[PDB]
């Protein structure tokens, strides 16, 4: 079988140097003239940068001269002026060339940070450049004489040198010389000579530098490249259309800057071809050459020189390199999109959560071609041109059509910062009059949408795959659980929770007090008709269920003691739940957990429609309630002014003491600030005691008091809005503010918002406010950088294998942060899968048998016993190379089951972590980066480098050496510690490797090195979570672990047999290859390694795909460094596959990539 | 510091300025140089007869007088006689080779030296000379390699009987019998060296000169040639500074500084070619013309992305001037039809002129916000044909196809024929008539009824909708 020739479908991509002969391969004619277009007949001048002869016809399937204009003639190259007649398209495809007179240095390989032509010859830059500007001569193949092969001579020196040995020694200068040097260089030869030198002379200064070169050369050998190539004979020209000369209005033209450049190269090149035939003196033809060497470089990468400015325009012209770069990092906004639109969003409580409110006017335009299609499908339109006219006419017929084409056809809604995957969600469209989008209220949470005028965009899933993807993955209803922490993200929001709370809440005595009812049905009949108060204490008959059988529903009836409200509500609740869940007061918390359990017990569908019922209902009764807010709602404690004057007298006290010198000045500042900070806590807990319960009401007897029904309390107690924090600024005094300084002011704002603030008090209120806005604006820019860092280090990571079959894992315990249980065990371990079976307190008792996915029942069977710590599989431990086995991950999803093969978790990990990032304030958000960046701390601790007994030797030469002494082993470890930092180590005591040998923070690096992979991995996860969880943010460890996994992708070698000894490389490759010697060729040996902690920013920097690399790293450098080596990208990763516009190798594409990936390296 | 002005500035900063006299030192050496070859060319037999053969082409009408000579030392009539004089001295010198010929071959060249040739032709001769020396050098090297490298013979004794001859067999077959270590060796290649000796002694026939003389001439010429360039080069180098002083004037005109001085440096190279010190005109002020010529001739030429004719450029300059007298003169600025009057020409051409006179614009011109929206980002593609349209087209085909099949097979062939429909070209109605054998007015009727048919509905309904 013959492989192929023409256009098949590629995988992989190669980059390399181009031959002059190769560059000629591409051209369809040498551009010979700086002419563009004619100036009157704006036709293109042959043969100059824009040409038909060389590139293509200016108009479709039409000869230039016009002889042949008929579409029948295609492969015809017209006789007058050489023009094959084809699409004008080819003027965007066909390249051209220029032959250079004298050789020319390619600015990339000359000036890309570490000069390639430089270090390839092992020749300094300032020398090579000198040879180029004709400042000095350099020998080449210096022969048996006096002179080194790469030695440089001066005018006068070269002269004299010549008098001696005429021939048999050779010197040149300028590009031709370098080109000479490179040509002659034998890489194969230099490879053998450099190998001798390595083994002969033993030096770290000598054989360290020695090794790095010889690996680089045989790279270049094996590359495919030839060194000469870096010096240009032939220069390709970009198809015109990409540097077009198009006309504008009022008749002026506009053009790409390349033309200024290109023209200049062409010109100077020509004027030089000229100078050679005029036999001009060397001083000029030299000068010219230099100008050509420049004019090229301004063309290729302007800026590695003086930066030629564009014509008449001060601004410098865009060179090819600056054409590639695009946009700190990079950023890369790009790709506008058809079938898309947007407008302001509004509410729609009437929506089912699986849909959304889309304007007639939008939908008409969006689905337009679809309509054209359904229109002439049924025959209402004779033809498409009619359909166009029909919908243009907005004929009434169409709307009945549009509803068809609309129906089962999801659309995508996406809002501004797309942060977690829930930033895009798919809904089923419901037609709307108005130019607003109607967005279901429960989703508004995920979107971080307010309705203060936020706008969202829409997108039509065109292709069938896209519809089904939108329906089975991106649909609203599939994401009701957060992927960051499996708690419901689709929890009732604010209006709706006040509603359920006010509904399921009770007062002391009201209509209906104490009667008894058949069931909720007549509870509502009771209320609607004004007989009972919504909240009145009542015994009613209710029927709960519990499916506690083996997947089977048990029914139970009882006279539960409840309220009219909670009764009514039981009408919503599905089947297998307890009446207990609705019997409380139902705050925003309880109301969410409710939802959660519903999911975890009855499955998806039932939660979905449950959640809907809750909104509708919550809204409904929210409405009935007539809750409101007036001035009188915000009640000042009657004691306030008193409290102030008391704490106010206290300052007058600490003053008397200061004026009297009893107390010092600074002493006093912190003292006063405390008594105020204190008074404030008094006034705080004052109003709240009054506010909270002081609705006092009477039942039959005398008196009783209960939690308030005051408008404003209900808001906070429920959790609908407000926090005791904010409240405290309404009624009680508002805080102490601090000046721009950071120095918190010693006379707090004693007045509140219900009162006025005065002139000074407001003005002080200003700073914190202004810093407030400012700060959060930046902690925006910071979160954003972070999340990008993370995806950049993660991304390509996907669930690949099913079970990597490791018994290995990390040990999960509750956090116990000094006090009590800052985080529980049930939380850490839920949804994770067990390393090894867990036993009771007594044993031979397998409660959970090795790896069982620890779901909710299980966590309770665990919690039933006192189970105190569980080992769990974590991504960081997973034996799988190049991915993550489903088992070691966990289950998590917005779906509750275990993670499926192919889900692209690195991303969602990144996302999940960085999204909430906005809410952070050592400590704070930067404190996170510091961790993920693996940044070593300023003033570190140091650890026992090895176990055994220690002692001090030598003395105070800036460092008093510490000498550790092992029991069995060799003694030789002595590290020299600064004696001007306080020790903790006991000087005659034995120390475990990884003990505290001074105090202070430690670098994660030590923890890794000295204490272990699981140690550091635990260091990171807990210390970072220390930050987020202080802030009330929930992120399942799974995520932090995937990042940690990526942090230690790399390792360094220590044994021998097949690899490079000192090299840093991916453990993946080792793990595979020491396994590829352990039963393979020779033991050889080997090799032992060392896991290395990389900061994410540094890890990410190493990536196999060079295309991926040009995305985020610096593009010029990436390409050069990669191009010389003749490097092949085989895609495989995500970024790059998008870049190149093919199926993502994860998710749906995973299936495809796999099926193809095997067809490769096959038969 | 890289920037090629610097390394140029310095490299020519070395070359020292000429004395008032030093201009003549070099001026003289040039004349010597040329004159040397002018005399070296005169001495060539084929160079004479060629100018003869070439003039016989000019009176028989196969060339022109402007194409051969550039005038002499001193009219079509005058030329005819000067040529007889030349033809005359040739025919005498020709038959005289019986010695005293020397006295006359010296004169033949004299008349020949009066002739100022077209530079093109001048070189051709020079060319035909060195080409013939290459042919001599070809046969000289074939005889040496076939002897020294192949048949193992010393070049030390190879050159002993060679000098004075290298044509006859006094070296080839008579020095093989000297019974030297290299003597009996020379017989194996005897067929290859003596058979190629055809072109070598034949050159003494074409050129009419022994291999002896042939080398001497264009050798003394080569030296003269080198001699001259050497001095001219030198002359140029002296004045590079001058170019710069001039070029500093024309800077922002749309061409790089160094772009100027290199074109101006070419003006200097020119002026050095056409100059004669014998006119007492200082090389200084005579050179400033040729440079300032080439600067401008270049500028006007190539500093535009859209190149415009020279008059056009000059037409423009006048215009910026006229608005100057009249800018402040008219309180504001003169109307578009005002300068129109000042100018000599149609005066509406002002609009026409003024429009092509604009330079194109950087597509990568930043537009508002300074933001990365750039001009080119707004330039829409007009060559494209949008999909509602590509759609209707895939469709018009469909309709015309169906509408014509629902017709009569002859009315289809008749219609597909009159129009370009799924056929190359369309056919003249007569062209159509002959194709069916039943013709003329007839086919035109078949046609009209077919249209007539497709005209009302059942049929009409669909096609109509394509009309907007
Ligand atoms: C050989 C080689 C490879 C890569 C580079 C760097 C270029 C790549 C293309 N590039 C951009 C997009 N590519 S994309 O597929 O459209 C896209 C989107 C959208 N989001 O992520 C991706 C990737 C932009 O958008 C955008 O801007 C500019 C920088 C240079 C040389
Ligand atoms: Mg909101
Ligand atoms: Mg807003
Ligand atoms: Zn043509
Ligand atoms: Zn695993």
Swiss-Prot record, chain A:
Organism superkingdom: Bacteria
Residues annotated to bind Zn(2+) 1: 63, 65, 78, 81
Record-listed E.C. numbers: 2.7.7.6
Keywords in alphabetical order: Acetylation, DNA-directed RNA polymerase, Magnesium, Metal-binding, Nucleotidyltransferase, Transcription, Transferase, Zinc
Pfam families: RNA_pol_Rpb1_1, RNA_pol_Rpb1_2, RNA_pol_Rpb1_3, RNA_pol_Rpb1_4, RNA_pol_Rpb1_5
Record flagged with keyword Acyltransferase: no
GO biological process terms on file: DNA-templated transcription
GO MF terms held by the record: DNA binding; DNA-directed RNA polymerase activity; magnesium ion binding; zinc ion binding
CDD domains: RNAP_beta'_C (cd02655), RNAP_beta'_N (cd01609)
Cofactor needs: Mg(2+); Zn(2+)
Free-text cofactor note: Binds 1 Mg(2+) ion per subunit.
Ranges annotated as spanning the membrane: none
Annotated binding of Mg(2+), by residue: 450, 452, 454
Residues noted as binding Zn(2+) 2 in the record, renumbered to the chain: 804, 878, 885, 888
Record's catalysed reaction(s): RNA(n) + a ribonucleoside 5'-triphosphate = RNA(n+1) + diphosphate
GO CC terms of this entry: DNA-directed RNA polymerase complex
Function according to Swiss-Prot or TrEMBL: DNA-dependent RNA polymerase catalyzes the transcription of DNA into RNA using the four ribonucleoside triphosphates as substrates.
HAMAP family, alphabetized: RNApol_bact_RpoC (MF_01322)
Quaternary data: The RNAP catalytic core consists of 2 alpha, 1 beta, 1 beta' and 1 omega subunit. When a sigma factor is associated with the core the holoenzyme is formed, which can initiate transcription.
Annotated family: Belongs to the RNA polymerase beta' chain family.
Protein name (database record): DNA-directed RNA polymerase subunit beta'
UniProtKB/Swiss-Prot annotation, chain B:
Region annotated Interaction with anti-sigma factors, chain positions: 440-455
Name of the protein in its database record: RNA polymerase sigma factor RpoD
Keywords attached to this entry: Cytoplasm, DNA-binding, Sigma factor, Transcription, Transcription regulation
Residue window of the full protein shown: 94 to 612 of 613
Gene Ontology cellular component terms for the protein in this record: cytosol; cytosolic DNA-directed RNA polymerase complex; sigma factor antagonist complex
Region (Sigma-70 factor domain-4): 403-456
Domain comment, as recorded: Contains 4 domains, connected by flexible linkers. In the active conformation, the domains are in an extended conformation, each making extensive interactions with the RNA polymerase catalytic core.
Motif Interaction with polymerase core subunit RpoC, residue numbers: 259-262
DNA-binding region: 429-448
Site positions per UniProt: Interaction with anti-sigma factors: 418
Region (Sigma-70 factor domain-2): 235-305
Function recorded in the entry: Sigma factors are initiation factors that promote the attachment of RNA polymerase to specific initiation sites and are then released. This sigma factor is the primary sigma factor during exponential growth. Preferentially transcribes genes associated with fast growth, such as ribosomal operons, other protein-synthesis related genes, rRNA- and tRNA-encoding genes and prfB.
Main location as per UniProt: cytoplasm
Subunit field text: Interacts transiently with the RNA polymerase catalytic core formed by RpoA, RpoB, RpoC and RpoZ (2 alpha, 1 beta, 1 beta' and 1 omega subunit) to form the RNA polymerase holoenzyme that can initiate transcription. Identified in a complex containing RpoD, the RNA polymerase subunits RpoA, RpoB and RpoZ, CRP and DNA. Interacts with Rsd; this prevents interaction with the RNA polymerase catalytic core and with promoter DNA, and as a consequence, promotes transcription from promoters that require alternative sigma factors. (Microbial infection) Interacts with Escherichia phage lambda antitermination protein Q.
Cell compartment(s), UniProt: Cytoplasm
Region of interest (Sigma-70 factor domain-3), residue spans: 314-390
Biological process per Gene Ontology, one example term: response to heat
Family: Belongs to the sigma-70 factor family. RpoD/SigA subfamily.
One example GO MF annotation: sigma factor activity
């Amino acid at each position: 079988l013959k492989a192929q020739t023409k256009t098949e479908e590629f995988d992989a991509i190669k980059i390399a140097l181009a031959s002059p002969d190769m560059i000629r391969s591409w051209s369809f004619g040498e551009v010979k003239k700086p002419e563009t277009i004619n100036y009157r007949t704006f036709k293109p001048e042959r043969d100059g940068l824009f040409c038909a002869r060389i590139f293509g016809p200016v108009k479709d399937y039409e000869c230039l001269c016009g002889k042949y204009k008929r579409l029948k003639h295609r492969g015809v190259i017209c006789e007058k002026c050489g023009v094959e007649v084809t699409q004008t398209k080819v003027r965007r495809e066909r390249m051209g060339h220029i032959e250079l007179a004298s050789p020319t240095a390619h600015i990339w390989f000359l000036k890309s940070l570490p000069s390639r032509i430089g270090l390839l010859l092992d020749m300094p830059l300032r020398d090579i450049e000198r040879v180029l500007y004709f400042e000095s001569y350099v020998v080449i193949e210096g022969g048996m004489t006096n002179l080194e092969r790469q030695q440089i001579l001066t005018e006068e020196q070269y002269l004299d040198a010549l008098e001696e040995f005429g021939d048999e020694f050779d010197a040149k200068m300028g590009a031709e010389a370098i080109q000479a040097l490179l040509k002659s260089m034998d890489l194969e030869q230099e490879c053998e000579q450099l190998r001798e030198e390595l083994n002969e002379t033993n030096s770290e200064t000598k054989r360290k530098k020695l090794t790095k070169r010889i690996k680089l050369l045989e790279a270049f050998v094996q590359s495919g490249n030839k060194p000469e190539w870096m010096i240009l004979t032939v220069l390709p020209v970009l198809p015109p259309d990409l540097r077009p000369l198009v006309p504008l209005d009022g008749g002026r033209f506009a053009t790409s800057d390349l033309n200024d450049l290109y023209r200049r190269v062409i010109n100077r090149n020509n004027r030089l071809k000229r100078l050679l035939d005029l036999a001009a003196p060397d001083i000029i033809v030299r000068n010219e050459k230099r100008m050509l060497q420049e004019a090229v470089d301004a063309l290729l990468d302007n800026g590695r020189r003086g930066r030629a400015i564009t014509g008449s325009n001060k601004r410098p012209l865009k060179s090819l390199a600056d054409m590639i770069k695009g946009k700190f990092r990079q950023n890369l906004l790009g790709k506008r999109v058809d079938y898309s639109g947007r407008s302001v969003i509004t509410v729609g409580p009437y929506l089912r959560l699986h849909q959304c409110g889309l304007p007639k006017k939008m939908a008409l335009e969006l689905f337009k071609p679809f309509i054209y299609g359904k229109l002439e499908l049924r025959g209402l339109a004779t033809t498409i041109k009619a359909a166009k006219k029909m919908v243009e006419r907005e004929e009434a017929v169409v709307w009945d059509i549009l509803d068809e084409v609309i129906r089962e056809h999801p659309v995508l809604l996406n809002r501004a910062p797309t942060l977690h995957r829930l930033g895009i969600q798919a809904f089923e469209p419901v037609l709307i009059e108005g130019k607003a989008i109607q967005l279901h209220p429960l989703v508004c949470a995920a979107y971080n949408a307010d309705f203060d005028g936020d706008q969202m965009a829409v997108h039509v899933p065109l292709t069938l795959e896209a519809q089904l993807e939108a329906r089975a993955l991106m649909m609203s209803t599939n994401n009701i659980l957060s992927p960051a922490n499996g708690e419901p993200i689709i929890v009732p929001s604010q209006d709706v929770v006040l509603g359920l709370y006010y509904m399921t809440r009770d007062c002391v005595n009201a209509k209906g007090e104490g009667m008894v009812l058949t069931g909720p049905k007549e509870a509502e009949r009771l209320y609607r008709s004004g007989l009972a108060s919504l909240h009145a204490r009542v015994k009613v008959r209710i029927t709960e269920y519990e499916k506690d059988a083996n997947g089977e529903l048990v029914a139970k009836t009882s006279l539960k003691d409840t309220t009219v409200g909670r009764a009514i509500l039981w009408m919503i609740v599905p089947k297998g739940l307890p009446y207990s869940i609705v019997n409380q007061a139902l705050g925003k918390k309880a109301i969410s957990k409710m939802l959660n359990t519903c999911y975890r017990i009855l499955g998806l569908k039932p939660t979905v429609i449950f959640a809907d019922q809750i909104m509708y209902t919550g809204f409904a009764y929210a409405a009935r309630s007539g809750a409101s807010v007036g001035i009188d709602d915000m009640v000042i404690p009657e004691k306030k002014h008193e409290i102030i004057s008391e704490a106010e007298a206290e300052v007058a006290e600490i003053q008397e003491q200061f004026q009297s010198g009893l107390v010092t000045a600074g002493e006093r500042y912190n003292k006063v600030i405390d008594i105020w900070a204190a008074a404030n806590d008094r006034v705080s807990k004052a109003m709240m005691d009054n506010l909270q319960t002081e609705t006092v009401i009477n039942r039959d007897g005398q008196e009783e008091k209960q939690v308030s029904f005051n408008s404003i309390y209900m808001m906070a107690d429920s959790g609908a809005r407000g926090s005791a924090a904010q409240i405290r600024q309404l009624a009680g005094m508002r805080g102490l503010m601090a000046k721009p300084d950071g120095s918190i002011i010693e006379t707090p704002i004693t007045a509140n918002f219900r009162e006025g603030l005065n002139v000074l008090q407001y003005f002080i209120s200003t700073h914190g406010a202004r810093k407030g806005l400012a700060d959060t604006a930046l902690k925006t820019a910071n979160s954003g950088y972070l999340t990008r860092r993370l995806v950049d280090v993660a991304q390509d990571l996907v669930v690949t294998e099913d079970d990597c079959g490791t018994h290995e894992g990390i040990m999960m315990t509750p956090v116990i942060e000094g006090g009590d249980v800052k985080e529980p065990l049930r939380d850490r371990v839920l949804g994770r899968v067990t390393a090894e079976d867990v036993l009771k307190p007594g044993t031979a008792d397998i409660l959970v048998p090795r790896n069982t996915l620890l779901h909710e029942q299980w966590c309770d069977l665990l919690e039933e016993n006192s189970v105190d710590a569980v080992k769990v599989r974590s991504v960081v431990s997973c034996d799988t190379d190049f991915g993550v086995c489903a088992h070691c991950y966990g289950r998590d999803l917005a779906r509750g089951h275990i993670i499926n093969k192919g889900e692209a978790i690195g991303v969602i990990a990144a996302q999940s972590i960085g999204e909430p990032g906005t809410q952070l304030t050592t400590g704070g958000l930067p404190r996170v980066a510091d961790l993920f960046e693996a940044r070593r701390p300023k003033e570190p601790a140091i650890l026992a480098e090895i176990s055994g007994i220690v002692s001090f030797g030598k003395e105070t030469k800036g460092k008093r050496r510490l000498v550790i002494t092992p029991v069995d082993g060799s003694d030789p470890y002595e590290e020299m510690i600064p004696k001007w930092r306080q020790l903790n180590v006991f000087e005659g005591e034995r120390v475990e490797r990884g003990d505290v040998i001074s105090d202070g923070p430690e670098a994660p690096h030590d923890i890794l090195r000295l204490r272990g992979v699981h140690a550091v991995t635990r260091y990171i996860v807990n210390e970072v979570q220390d930050v987020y969880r202080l802030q009330g943010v929930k992120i399942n460890d799974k995520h932090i672990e995937v990042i940690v996994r990526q942090m230690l992708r790399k390792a360094t070698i220590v044994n021998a047999g097949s690899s490079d000894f000192l090299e840093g490389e991916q453990v993946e490759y080792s793990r595979v290859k020491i396994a590829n010697r352990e039963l393979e060729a020779n033991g050889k040996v080997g090799a032992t390694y060392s896991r290395d902690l990389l900061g994410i920013t540094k890890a990410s920097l190493a990536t196999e795909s060079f295309i991926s690399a040009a995305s985020f790293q610096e593009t010029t450098r990436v390409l050069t460094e990669a191009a010389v080596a003749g490097k092949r990208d085989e895609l495989r990763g995500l970024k790059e596959n998008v870049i190149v516009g093919r199926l993502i190798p994860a998710g749906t594409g995973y299936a495809y990539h796999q099926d193809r990936m095997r067809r490769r390296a096959a038969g | 510091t890289t920037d090629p002005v610097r390394m140029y500035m310095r490299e020519m900063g070395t070359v020292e300025l000429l004395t008032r006299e030093g201009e003549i030192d070099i001026a003289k050496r040039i004349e010597d140089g040329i004159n040397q070859v002018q005399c070296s060319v005169a001495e060539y037999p084929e160079a004479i007869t060629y100018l003869l053969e070439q003039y016989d082409r000019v009176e028989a009408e196969e060339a022109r007088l402007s194409d051969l000579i550039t005038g002499f030392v001193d009219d079509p009539e005058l030329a005819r006689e000067k040529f007889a004089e030349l033809r005359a001295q040739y025919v005498v010198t020709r038959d005289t080779i019986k010695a005293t010929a020397q006295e006359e071959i010296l004169k033949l060249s004299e008349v020949f030296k009066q002739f100022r040739l077209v530079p093109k032709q001048f070189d051709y001769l020079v060319n035909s000379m060195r080409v013939m020396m290459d042919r001599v050098r070809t046969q000289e090297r074939l005889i040496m390699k076939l002897c020294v490298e192949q048949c193992k013979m010393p070049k030390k004794n190879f050159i002993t009987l060679f000098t004075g001859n290298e044509t006859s067999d006094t070296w080839f077959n008579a020095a093989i019998a000297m019974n030297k270590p290299w003597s009996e060796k020379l017989h194996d290649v005897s067929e290859e060296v003596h058979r190629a000796l055809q072109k070598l002694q034949q050159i003494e026939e074409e050129t009419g000169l022994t291999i002896e003389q042939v080398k001497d001439i264009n050798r003394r010429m080569s030296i003269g040639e080198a001699k001259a360039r050497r001095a001219k080069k030198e002359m140029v180098e002296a004045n590079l500074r001058l170019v710069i002083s001039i070029a500093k004037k024309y800077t922002n005109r749309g061409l790089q500084f160094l772009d100027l001085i290199q074109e101006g440096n070419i003006g200097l190279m020119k002026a050095v070619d056409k100059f004669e010190y014998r006119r007492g005109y200082k090389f200084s002020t005579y050179a400033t013309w040729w440079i300032r010529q080439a600067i401008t001739r270049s500028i006007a030429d190539q500093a535009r992305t859209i190149r415009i004719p020279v008059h056009m450029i000059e037409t423009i300059n006048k215009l910026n001037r006229i608005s100057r007298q009249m800018l402040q003169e008219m309180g504001r600025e003169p109307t578009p039809e005002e300068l129109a009057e000042r100018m000599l020409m149609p005066e509406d051409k002002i609009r026409k002129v003024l429009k092509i006179a604009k330079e194109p614009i950087s597509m990568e011109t930043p537009i508002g916000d300074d933001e990365d929206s750039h001009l080119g980002d707004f330039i829409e593609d007009t060559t494209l044909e949008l999909p509602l349209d590509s759609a209707t087209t895939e469709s018009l085909r469909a309709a015309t196809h169906d509408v014509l099949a629902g017709l009569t097979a002859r009315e289809a062939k008749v219609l597909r024929m009159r129009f370009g429909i799924d056929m190359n070209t369309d056919y003249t109605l007569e062209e159509v008539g002959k194709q069916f054998d039943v013709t003329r007015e007839r086919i035109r009727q078949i046609e009209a009824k077919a249209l007539r048919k497709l005209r009302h509905p059942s049929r009409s309904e669909v096609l109509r909708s394509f009309l907007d």
